[PDB]
Amino acid sequence: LLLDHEALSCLLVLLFVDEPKLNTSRLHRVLRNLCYHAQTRHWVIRSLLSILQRSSSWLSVSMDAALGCRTNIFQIQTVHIHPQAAPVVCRHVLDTLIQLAKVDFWDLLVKLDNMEASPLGQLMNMLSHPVIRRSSLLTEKLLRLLSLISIGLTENQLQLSVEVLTSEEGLEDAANVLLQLSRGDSGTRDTVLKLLLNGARHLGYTLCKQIGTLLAELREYNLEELQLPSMSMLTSKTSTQKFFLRVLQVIIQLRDLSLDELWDMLGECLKELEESHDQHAVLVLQPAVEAFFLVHATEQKFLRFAETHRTVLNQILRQSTTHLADGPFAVLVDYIRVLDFDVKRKYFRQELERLDEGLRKEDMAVHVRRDHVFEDSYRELHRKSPEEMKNRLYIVFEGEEGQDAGGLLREWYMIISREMFNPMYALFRTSPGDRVTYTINPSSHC
Amino acid sequence: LISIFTEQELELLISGLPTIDIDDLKSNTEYHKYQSNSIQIQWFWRALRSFDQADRAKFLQFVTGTSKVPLQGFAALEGMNGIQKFQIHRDDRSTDRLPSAHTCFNQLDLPAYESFEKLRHMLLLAI
């Protein structure tokens, strides 16, 4: 027992006072080092968690909380924290708890003033309490904390409401929590999967209601650009589309949802957007399409979809910076008629760079004579490796002046593509029908 | 990885998408059973103008056998027997079959499709 509970209480009072200057990382490292002693750790954490629950004269600490309101952080009459200061006491305590997770107090505190795995249940209950559930920052920190600690039914319901209701990093830490819980028990896996499905069905039902208003309003728009107000609640960053897709990506990450009323009305809605002669107007349904192709086309029906909306899914992909062969729409790589030429060209060049991403490319000289370029290049390269060809070639003509290498390369390629069709090399001959094309010269054995 | 392109698209990848002077082609088109003011021909020009550069190139490949645009313009469009202009023929066969091409004559046989939309659909499905 290096330090007593009164000295620990004096240190912990520093978490309430919000001073920017104060070095709270050093204070966290002091508490961390003190918390190597198991009894100190246990009392410290039980106090910090009592501070969170109680957030949800020496002790005269005035925090400027709002306009014209300078609150006292402590109301002593059984010691309460004034709810204006609470979100800061929460923020500092969760900042300390994240480090202690990487690695009585009130009665002592009034005595002054007059002069991992078990409490995971409390930290999951904390999600219900209003100062936390309001604040996206405190929620993100508490979720990061839970995601570290994870390394019951209501407590998972409260963790899932964090996804069905409102933080991409905090909800990816919530995904980590829900995964690492499912690693724990088949029973928590099952209850959290089925309650994800329950929430995803609610999200799907209300998404079908929203798209039903959108489609109806597109009917009323045509029957007489697209800024349908029903679109606002789909454009929104916090739209049920993004919630539905997030939840489905977590379900599919746990696998290692019957909604034909949604999928067929997303269908007729997309068809009625495409018939309405606007293009980016589809993109307000891109995440619902990506959910459709997540739930279907499991690692057919998605192909009839991609057929009847082919040019639309191409507009989607062309607009999307999601890498065609790294995103969800990768499955259709092998059914290639469902992409645009320039989409396939982009896919080509990105997949080519992915396969060749390990090769460092250098610059590489090719020394040729203006009158012999073809044979000098053949001698230089024809025994070179593919990876030596993959180097950036720069061509030097003997004694010629320096010039722009890009124009000089374009000239070199032009001259080579010409010399290919000199009959002296016997590589290519014109089609006797067309007379402008070229095919292999069957007299190249000369 | 190259097999994602079609046999058309590989030409468009190696030699690039051409710029089609539709005015030069139209000025160098021969109409055999259609006429220049036939409704299917006005539909043809509307369709081909509505087609993107790649579908125009695929049409040029469809009718000439290549995407190569003649440097001198389509007045210099070659066929098997010297300069042969692009040419549209009415295909008096059933209009439930695609147009058909005889590229050595730069010849299109084109059924009398009943509507702009249907003609456009059939041509786009051909290319």
PDB file of C-alpha atoms in Angstrom, chain A residues 333 336 339-349 351-352 355 432-438, chain B residues 1-6 9 12-13 17 52 54 64-66 68 78-83 103:
ATOM      1  CA  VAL A 333     -15.984  -9.703 -61.702  1.00  0.00           C
ATOM      2  CA  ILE A 336     -18.361  -9.000 -67.011  1.00  0.00           C
ATOM      3  CA  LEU A 339     -19.940  -3.383 -66.461  1.00  0.00           C
ATOM      4  CA  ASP A 340     -19.140  -0.382 -68.627  1.00  0.00           C
ATOM      5  CA  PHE A 341     -15.990  -0.418 -70.729  1.00  0.00           C
ATOM      6  CA  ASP A 342     -14.300   2.398 -68.797  1.00  0.00           C
ATOM      7  CA  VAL A 343     -15.339   0.819 -65.484  1.00  0.00           C
ATOM      8  CA  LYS A 344     -13.650  -2.381 -66.621  1.00  0.00           C
ATOM      9  CA  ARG A 345     -10.624  -0.337 -67.719  1.00  0.00           C
ATOM     10  CA  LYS A 346     -10.409   1.215 -64.238  1.00  0.00           C
ATOM     11  CA  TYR A 347     -10.836  -2.221 -62.650  1.00  0.00           C
ATOM     12  CA  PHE A 348      -8.129  -3.546 -64.960  1.00  0.00           C
ATOM     13  CA  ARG A 349      -5.653  -0.860 -63.944  1.00  0.00           C
ATOM     14  CA  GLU A 351      -6.325  -4.925 -60.105  1.00  0.00           C
ATOM     15  CA  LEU A 352      -3.130  -4.815 -62.169  1.00  0.00           C
ATOM     16  CA  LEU A 355      -1.161  -7.768 -58.305  1.00  0.00           C
ATOM     17  CA  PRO A 432      -6.854  -8.896 -98.152  1.00  0.00           C
ATOM     18  CA  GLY A 433     -10.498  -7.992 -97.441  1.00  0.00           C
ATOM     19  CA  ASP A 434     -10.155  -4.910 -95.273  1.00  0.00           C
ATOM     20  CA  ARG A 435      -6.653  -3.935 -96.510  1.00  0.00           C
ATOM     21  CA  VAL A 436      -6.077  -1.553 -93.581  1.00  0.00           C
ATOM     22  CA  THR A 437      -5.950  -4.075 -90.692  1.00  0.00           C
ATOM     23  CA  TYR A 438      -3.072  -6.415 -89.863  1.00  0.00           C
TER      24      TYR A 438
ATOM     25  CA  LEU B   1      -7.203  -9.535 -66.235  1.00  0.00           C
ATOM     26  CA  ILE B   2      -7.218  -8.629 -69.912  1.00  0.00           C
ATOM     27  CA  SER B   3     -10.189 -11.013 -70.406  1.00  0.00           C
ATOM     28  CA  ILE B   4     -12.579  -8.526 -68.769  1.00  0.00           C
ATOM     29  CA  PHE B   5     -12.544  -6.541 -72.000  1.00  0.00           C
ATOM     30  CA  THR B   6     -14.441  -7.688 -75.056  1.00  0.00           C
ATOM     31  CA  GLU B   9     -12.901  -3.325 -75.915  1.00  0.00           C
ATOM     32  CA  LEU B  12     -10.433   0.351 -77.691  1.00  0.00           C
ATOM     33  CA  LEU B  13      -7.868  -0.286 -74.929  1.00  0.00           C
ATOM     34  CA  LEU B  17     -11.633   5.499 -78.224  1.00  0.00           C
ATOM     35  CA  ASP B  52     -21.458   7.335 -76.024  1.00  0.00           C
ATOM     36  CA  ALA B  54     -17.511   3.660 -76.970  1.00  0.00           C
ATOM     37  CA  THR B  64     -16.388  -1.397 -91.015  1.00  0.00           C
ATOM     38  CA  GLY B  65     -14.826  -4.238 -89.042  1.00  0.00           C
ATOM     39  CA  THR B  66     -12.553  -1.797 -87.198  1.00  0.00           C
ATOM     40  CA  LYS B  68      -9.963   2.909 -86.886  1.00  0.00           C
ATOM     41  CA  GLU B  78     -11.980   1.689 -97.677  1.00  0.00           C
ATOM     42  CA  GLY B  79     -13.752  -1.571 -98.430  1.00  0.00           C
ATOM     43  CA  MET B  80     -12.699  -4.709-100.298  1.00  0.00           C
ATOM     44  CA  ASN B  81     -13.055  -3.084-103.735  1.00  0.00           C
ATOM     45  CA  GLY B  82     -11.600   0.376-103.144  1.00  0.00           C
ATOM     46  CA  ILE B  83     -13.153   3.240-101.231  1.00  0.00           C
ATOM     47  CA  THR B 103     -17.812  -5.319 -93.484  1.00  0.00           C
TER      48      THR B 103
END
